[PDB]
Amino acid sequence: GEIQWMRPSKEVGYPIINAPSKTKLEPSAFHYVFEGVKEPAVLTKNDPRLKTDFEEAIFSKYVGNKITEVDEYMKEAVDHYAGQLMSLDINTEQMCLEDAMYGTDGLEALDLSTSAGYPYVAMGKKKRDILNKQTRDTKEMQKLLDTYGINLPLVTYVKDELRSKTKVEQGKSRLIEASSLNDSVAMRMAFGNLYAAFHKNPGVITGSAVGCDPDLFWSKIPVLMEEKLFAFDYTGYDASLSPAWFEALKMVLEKIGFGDRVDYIDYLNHSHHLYKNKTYCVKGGMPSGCSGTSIFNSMINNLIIRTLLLKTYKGIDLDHLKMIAYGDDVIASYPHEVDASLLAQSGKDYGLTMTPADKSATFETVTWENVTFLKRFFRADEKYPFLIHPVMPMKEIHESIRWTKDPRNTQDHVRSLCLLAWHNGEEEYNKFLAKIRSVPIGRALDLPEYSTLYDRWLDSF
């Protein structure tokens, strides 16, 4: 990913974008009851915490494009993956605007919360006026589509979230590249069935984990994997992607019945952005807020791992590559051990920066004891080991609970964290509940008891 040019949105007929300059994250009732070291991300150039230019930093993610064409390996990678997907018998038809707007089996309705994007964001018009569940009225949207068309600029916001002190001082705030309700709808109509098939099929055939339910899915994964697990982390995956990987992606879509509209992929690759008062053009890089960012990122990651394997181990049997990805995150396996470090090397050549799994100092042997996926670990239940516990570190929860954006969502926020934490074990969960109930706010929450959660879990399978 790389920015071709950037300039005053006025110089090209685009209005300025008002981006709130103050975070919505303030200390929560449990701020001093739990330990945390994260603070809200820098939102403006002025943040006294900054130690380098904000503009430079928030864009540093676009390290450039490393490859040009789609080589032999990539092509083979494409064939193999496209091969697997073929077996899912994916419906290639388009999705009727209605099902695409309000949802259908395999696809959730649009999220009334997220930005409507341009031009609406600048017109004040919000989704709540265009959509409206009850009737599933296509008319207003249908109208707006003809009126404003598609392939509209991406509105860019700084993501308001908790970050390390380092990523605070270094202005390393993440950015949200929001898509227009139109493009979002168009794409959902174009790929809606692809999206559905993936959500309904997390596993090693789609190589996707998108849509998955950790509480159930974790037990299925170990069975799907091969003997030897191999993993690593990406650094700026999304932004590091080069045009070639997008072309490779289209080659797959094409091979499975979507050549029809692979054009949509072109705007993810080459895209138009509006950030504040400026406008820029990016070559490469997967935008964060588009319909299908997750899935396409996962499909591409599936192409990548195959590639680096075909390029490093001539003769490698891709059919025994069992991997599951969720955007840049991934968990893979092969009958034989492989060198993560070696693969990471071939990676640089493809414009990917790969480092030891979970910020390890070095690439080490991946095991069921240390491997993570979505920050979560794998732990077989003591009483019934054939049931695997998706285990997220308590630290992650402690951090999240020390802050709040809205007091009205405290019940929901804590309840959620509880559904995550209890997997750490009864002793741990109860200490957690104890502390929560050590201040007025918590004592007023409707939190589930361990035994309740654990039994429900057992029956869920």
Cite the annotated binding site for Mg(2+) by residue number. Answer: 233, 328
The site map against ligand ATP for 274-303 (x = CB under 6 A) is: --------------x---------------
Least distance to ligand ATP, CB of residue 235, Å: 3
**Alpha helix positions (H), 262-421:** 263-269, 293-312, 340-349, 394-401, 410-421
Minimum CB distance to Na ion, residue 285 (Å): 4
> What's the closest the beta carbon of residue 179 comes to ligand ATP, in angstroms?
12
Single out the residue of 168, 158, 162 nearest to residue 20, CA to CA.
158
Question: CA angle at residue 436 from 430 to 442, to 5 degrees?
Answer: 130
Rule CB under 6 A: is residue 238 a binding residue for ligand ATP? Answer: yes
From CA 397, how far away is CA 168, in angstroms rounded? 20
Q: Is 117 in the site for Na ion (CB under 5 A)?
A: no
Q: Cβ 164 to ligand ATP, closest distance in Å?
A: 9
Q: Establish if 235 lies at the interface with ligand ATP (CB under 6 A).
A: yes
Whole-Å CA distances, 56 to 63, 160, 170, 258: 12, 18, 10, 38
Helices and strands of the chain, counted as H and E runs: 19, 16
Asked if 285 touches Na ion (CB under 5 A), the answer is: yes
> Using the rule CB under 5 A, is 282 a contact of Na ion?
yes
Q: Does 251 bind Na ion (CB under 5 A)?
A: no
CB 251 within 8 A of CB 78: yes
Closest to 50 (Cα-Cα) out of 174, 172, 175: 172
Residue 78 DSSP class: H
Cα dihedral value 67, 70, 75, 80, nearest 10:
50
175 binds ligand ATP (CB under 6 A): yes
Q: Is 63 exposed, middle or buried, given 0-12, 13-18 or 19+ CB atoms closer than 10 A?
A: middle
How many residues lie near Na ion (CB under 5 A)? 3
Which of the choices Na ion, ligand ATP, none does residue 421 contact, using the CB cut-off of 5 to 8 A by kind?
A: none
Site string for ligand ATP, 87-106 (x = CB under 6 A): --------------------
Our finding on whether 328 is near ligand ATP (CB under 6 A) is yes
Stretch in the footprint of Na ion (CB under 5 A) among 53-61, 127-135, 269-277, 367-375? 269-277
In this structure, what DSSP letter does residue 254 have? I
**Measured distance CA(365)–CA(344) in Å, rounded:** 14
Residue 236 makes contact with ligand ATP by CB under 6 A: yes
Does residue 304 bind Na ion (CB under 5 A)?
no
375 binding ligand ATP? (CB under 6 A): no
Q: Which residues bind Na ion (CB under 5 A)?
A: 271, 282, 285
Q: Which residues bind ligand ATP (CB under 6 A)?
A: 159, 172, 174-176, 233, 235-238, 288, 327-328
